[PDB]
Amino acid sequence: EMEKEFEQIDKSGSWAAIYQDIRHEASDFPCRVAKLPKNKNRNRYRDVSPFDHSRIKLHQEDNDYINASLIKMEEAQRSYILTQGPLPNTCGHFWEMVWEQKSRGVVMLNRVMEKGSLKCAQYWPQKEEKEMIFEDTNLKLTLISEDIKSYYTVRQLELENLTTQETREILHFHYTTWPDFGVPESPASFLNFLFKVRESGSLSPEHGPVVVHCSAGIGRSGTFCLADTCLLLMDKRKDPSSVDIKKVLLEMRKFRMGLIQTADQLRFSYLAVIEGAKFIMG
């Protein structure tokens, strides 16, 4: 299948070559809305924008914009909403999306601070008694419980639509051990983090798309989605060795640019899948 193709690439030391080929083959679509001067303060990086054809819209007539894209994998029957790390001024928007899209859980692969710099806003309450209120989108978020573990931390939050008083339970899944530089030495933690997300049913069809992000919401987030889909495909297909991860990444890139920002990440994605398939098959 790919495991061998993995070593083949390894010995030849062609990881940067393959990854570049992917950047070349990646789809190209208009991001007119994202580019609008009106929404400049709604984007983190100027080089990371959502395609207009697959962007997520906010249910509000004034402005429906948010740097988030819906990645829908037809064959895998799986959908992920990839979005940028929330900004000081886009936390209300981020939760309004989680509400309107009926998401069961939020997936975070970075820490609020990395490399001594800010990667995204502190968009969720850290204390039960001190909840957060997103005035602009009229939503209240409350920390219900927290389960801090070695490599990941799962939070049980309560999102309430102050407009209707209706409340919903959100599962915040936070992988907190991704290294400062490079990628994980072992996919073990990441793979286990992924299965936990699966176990909550946050990825299941009965709920709205799961929201995934990171500073830019394309690099590490990409690894998450790509890995899940590929493993999922190896279980469904009659021939598991047919799953071409590169082919899968390209399909995902028709939906959002950049998914998998480096060669090492691409390498890691293979590793994760290979090791993930091993754990599942048999």
From Swiss-Prot:
Expressed in keratinocytes (at protein level). The modification Phosphotyrosine is found at Y19, Y65. It comes from the Eukaryota. There is a cross-link at C214-S215 (N,N-(cysteine-1,S-diyl)serine (Cys-Ser)). The modification Cysteine sulfinic acid (-SO2H) is found at C214. Tyrosine-protein phosphatase which acts as a regulator of endoplasmic reticulum unfolded protein response. Mediates dephosphorylation of EIF2AK3/PERK; inactivating the protein kinase activity of EIF2AK3/PERK. May play an important role in CKII- and p60c-src-induced signal transduction cascades. May regulate the EFNA5-EPHA3 signaling pathway which modulates cell reorganization and cell-cell repulsion. May also regulate the hepatocyte growth factor receptor signaling pathway through dephosphorylation of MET. This is Tyrosine-protein phosphatase non-receptor type 1. The gene is PTPN1. The chain holds residues 2 to 283 of 435 of the full protein.
